[PDB]
Enzyme design. Sequence first.
Site, short mmCIF file in Angstrom:
data_model
loop_
_atom_site.label_atom_id
_atom_site.label_comp_id
_atom_site.label_asym_id
_atom_site.label_seq_id
_atom_site.Cartn_x
_atom_site.Cartn_y
_atom_site.Cartn_z
N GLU A 286 -13.23 12.54 -4.65
CA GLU A 286 -11.99 12.49 -3.89
C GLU A 286 -10.94 13.39 -4.54
O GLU A 286 -10.34 14.24 -3.87
CB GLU A 286 -11.45 11.06 -3.83
N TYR B 113 -2.94 13.97 0.83
CA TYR B 113 -2.60 14.40 -0.51
C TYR B 113 -2.89 15.86 -0.87
O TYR B 113 -2.13 16.49 -1.58
CB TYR B 113 -3.25 13.48 -1.51
N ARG C 201 4.56 3.22 -4.39
CA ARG C 201 5.38 2.34 -3.57
C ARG C 201 4.78 1.00 -3.24
O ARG C 201 5.49 0.00 -3.21
CB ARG C 201 5.83 3.03 -2.27
N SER C 202 3.48 0.97 -3.00
CA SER C 202 2.77 -0.25 -2.64
C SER C 202 1.38 -0.25 -3.24
O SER C 202 0.62 0.71 -3.07
CB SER C 202 2.65 -0.35 -1.12
N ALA C 203 1.01 -1.36 -3.87
CA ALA C 203 -0.30 -1.46 -4.49
C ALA C 203 -1.04 -2.77 -4.36
O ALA C 203 -0.53 -3.83 -4.70
CB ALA C 203 -0.20 -1.07 -5.95
N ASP C 204 -2.25 -2.66 -3.82
CA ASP C 204 -3.20 -3.74 -3.65
C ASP C 204 -3.80 -3.85 -5.05
O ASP C 204 -4.67 -3.04 -5.44
CB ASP C 204 -4.26 -3.29 -2.65
N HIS D 66 1.03 -6.12 -5.06
CA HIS D 66 0.64 -7.35 -4.39
C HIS D 66 -0.85 -7.70 -4.47
O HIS D 66 -1.70 -6.83 -4.66
CB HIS D 66 1.06 -7.29 -2.93
N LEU D 67 -1.14 -8.98 -4.26
CA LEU D 67 -2.49 -9.50 -4.30
C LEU D 67 -2.72 -10.26 -3.01
O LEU D 67 -2.14 -11.33 -2.82
CB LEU D 67 -2.61 -10.46 -5.47
N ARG E 241 12.05 18.68 -17.61
CA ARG E 241 12.08 17.31 -17.09
C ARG E 241 12.00 17.38 -15.58
O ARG E 241 12.36 16.43 -14.87
CB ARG E 241 13.36 16.61 -17.48
N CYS F 216 0.99 6.14 -0.65
CA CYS F 216 1.30 5.03 -1.56
C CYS F 216 1.62 5.66 -2.91
O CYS F 216 2.60 5.31 -3.57
CB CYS F 216 0.09 4.09 -1.70
N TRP G 160 -12.39 7.93 3.47
CA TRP G 160 -11.45 8.36 4.50
C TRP G 160 -11.97 8.45 5.94
O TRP G 160 -11.25 8.95 6.82
CB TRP G 160 -10.85 9.69 4.09
O1 UMP Z 1 22.95 9.41 -13.68
C1 UMP Z 1 22.77 10.53 -14.18
C2 UMP Z 1 22.95 11.91 -13.62
C3 UMP Z 1 22.72 13.08 -14.43
N1 UMP Z 1 22.32 12.93 -15.71
C4 UMP Z 1 21.79 14.07 -16.55
C5 UMP Z 1 20.27 14.07 -16.74
C6 UMP Z 1 19.98 15.28 -17.60
O2 UMP Z 1 20.26 14.96 -18.95
C7 UMP Z 1 20.95 16.38 -17.13
C8 UMP Z 1 20.20 17.42 -16.29
O3 UMP Z 1 19.19 18.12 -17.13
P1 UMP Z 1 17.74 18.48 -16.50
O4 UMP Z 1 17.04 17.20 -16.64
O5 UMP Z 1 17.87 18.81 -15.08
O6 UMP Z 1 17.02 19.54 -17.25
O7 UMP Z 1 21.95 15.55 -16.30
C9 UMP Z 1 22.15 11.64 -16.25
O8 UMP Z 1 21.84 11.37 -17.39
N2 UMP Z 1 22.37 10.52 -15.49
O1 UMP Z 2 -4.35 3.38 -4.89
C1 UMP Z 2 -4.11 2.82 -3.81
C2 UMP Z 2 -4.08 3.35 -2.40
C3 UMP Z 2 -3.81 2.48 -1.29
N1 UMP Z 2 -3.57 1.17 -1.52
C4 UMP Z 2 -3.02 0.24 -0.46
C5 UMP Z 2 -1.54 -0.11 -0.64
C6 UMP Z 2 -1.22 -1.04 0.52
O2 UMP Z 2 -1.68 -2.35 0.20
C7 UMP Z 2 -2.01 -0.52 1.72
C8 UMP Z 2 -1.06 0.20 2.69
O3 UMP Z 2 -0.08 -0.77 3.26
P1 UMP Z 2 1.46 -0.31 3.47
O4 UMP Z 2 2.00 -0.48 2.12
O5 UMP Z 2 1.53 1.10 3.85
O6 UMP Z 2 2.20 -1.17 4.43
O7 UMP Z 2 -2.99 0.45 1.03
C9 UMP Z 2 -3.61 0.67 -2.83
O8 UMP Z 2 -3.45 -0.49 -3.16
N2 UMP Z 2 -3.86 1.48 -3.90
#
Ligand code: UMP
Ligand code: UMP
Lengths: 316, 316
Positions: B60, B146, B218-221, B259-260, B178, B198, B82
């Site tokens: 994959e 992806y 964002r979301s994980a089984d 989540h589980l 960074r 995800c 897939w």
């Molecule tokens: O809430 C905030 C907003 C900006 N900066 C800082 C992060 C970095 O130290 C700098 C930008 O440097 P680069 O990471 O982009 O290189 O601005 C923070 O610390 N906190």
């Molecule tokens: O590494 C991975 C890829 C996919 N999913 C899961 C996450 C969610 O449980 C589901 C998609 O549901 P939504 O979060 O999109 O609603 O697929 C995982 O747990 N792990």
Amino acid sequence: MLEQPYLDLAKKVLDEGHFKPDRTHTGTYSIFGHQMRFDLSKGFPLLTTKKVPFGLIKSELLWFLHGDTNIRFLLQHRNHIWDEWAFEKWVKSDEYHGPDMTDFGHRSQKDPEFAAVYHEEMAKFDDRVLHDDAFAAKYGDLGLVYGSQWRAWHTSKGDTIDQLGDVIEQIKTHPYSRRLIVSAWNPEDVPTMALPPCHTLYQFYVNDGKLSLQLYQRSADIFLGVPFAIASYALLTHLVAHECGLEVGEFIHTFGDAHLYVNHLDQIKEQLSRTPRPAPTLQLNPDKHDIFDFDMKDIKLLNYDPYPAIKAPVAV
Amino acid sequence: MLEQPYLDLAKKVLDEGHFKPDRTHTGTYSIFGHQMRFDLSKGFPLLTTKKVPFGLIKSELLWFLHGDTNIRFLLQHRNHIWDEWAFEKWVKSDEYHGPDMTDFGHRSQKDPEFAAVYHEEMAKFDDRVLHDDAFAAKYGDLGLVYGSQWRAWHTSKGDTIDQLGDVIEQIKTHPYSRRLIVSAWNPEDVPTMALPPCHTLYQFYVNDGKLSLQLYQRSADIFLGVPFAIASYALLTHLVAHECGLEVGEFIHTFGDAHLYVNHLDQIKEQLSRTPRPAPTLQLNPDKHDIFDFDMKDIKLLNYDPYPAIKAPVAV
Ligand SMILES: O=c1ccn([C@H]2C[C@H](O)[C@@H](COP(=O)(O)O)O2)c(=O)[nH]1
Ligand SMILES: O=c1ccn([C@H]2C[C@H](O)[C@@H](COP(=O)(O)O)O2)c(=O)[nH]1
């Protein structure tokens, strides 16, 4: 005490933090991967161990919520956090027929006379932004800033998307969704951006009638920037909740590169010798519900009793 | 033991996890905001407490690294992770003159006869994808996956960006940056995507000659998807490092909604009654350096001795 996770984060970087050089050629002590958690029900996480200017955070966030990208509004609010960004466009342009200003910010540190000159050129730029309506449209519009990213994402079809607006509506109709994400990172723009968004992305979540928000910040200046970011986004979590008629839960701060500039070390130990006092209270206007319409006067901060502010140089 | 953070994460959700309903109408126990950390120098984090098919993860990831979005390659690799995604496009289209298939996946759970019928319609779709070159171009191209997100982000100017490629070059020339971020989240596309990514975004980081990667999911089984995501991205961290001539450091997994599923609870306690054995070793081909050119045979996994696999229904 609520702000404890921040003191912890700071103390930690001093300890486990390995030295690491950076963009601005100042040295930094860095840790990669860290997450902290504030229970917004216990109070507002505005640091009490050093005075943070809530007014700056407040007027800035509103600017963002208005999908605004012009400096004129912040200036109208005595806020200048974004001046240099618009000012630098002014100096590299055909009109700026003034004194030497290349690398102004850095040079200010060790001014030959530069300081008062720079500080006055800015007074000029700013006043014109506030008054010459056409000047503002040219040198006061930062362009791609959090406001235009949250509320006006430009699409491949010359259109615009209101990520935040949409996400709020989602919270209202599908609060259990795991797709409540607003993004500031645009692959197309970062290659030529002055400062790619640090507050890279955040995620909303609802459960048990409480709203939570998790921010993912790619890079964070522990001393200067972190105290503000905790305050901005916790305020956001309150606004959005008050709007969706939900209770406030937790604010979760995740870091990519959390660092402490080498020139900040004394100031931070200085801060770590203080004891937190109880955390302030946020009081939002009950009559208003459209956060997009909120005004400076609709947000009250009760019981804020902090220690004197700590001064430190902006490492560049 | 290396996989301990995963067992910890699982045990935790059972305990602190509050019930929360979801999209697929199965119930889930959820926690919001969590981060774990694997030290990729101690070994490879492929679970030993239940057999994970490394071959699926491997074929994959390569597909992704090729900026490929067609199923034909995975099929050529016995990989069908897939299928349903391409298959569903096939069934909603004018050509599919076959039996009932609407909601096929869910219905398979309680088949009236459906199972063998569905499983055969798929055998058809897949074979055609592999052979009818024109069929593949139509129903085998998932589109925005992806691969096209990492290596072919479409811009507002009808162009394409290779985020990963660029990030690798950055690591080579500015390892202390960074801004080593690759994003999968596109504001424009998520509103009409079948499954928004995800594995939302990841960040590279270098220091002390070691590379680290932080993924924000964002979301994980916890049961089904997490074991794979840990394996995919840790493998990525090795590939990229081997390419940039760096040492491998840590893999950091941050979660939004961990989540589980309610129907997985027995299987997970079952797993939590096992003791981890030492972690396997990843062996990469020393001759090859262009990870974009890696082949299935260039990635060896040594000392993999896992417990029997645990079977559980895909909650929908
Ligand atoms: O809430 C905030 C907003 C900006 N900066 C800082 C992060 C970095 O130290 C700098 C930008 O440097 P680069 O990471 O982009 O290189 O601005 C923070 O610390 N906190
Ligand atoms: O590494 C991975 C890829 C996919 N999913 C899961 C996450 C969610 O449980 C589901 C998609 O549901 P939504 O979060 O999109 O609603 O697929 C995982 O747990 N792990």
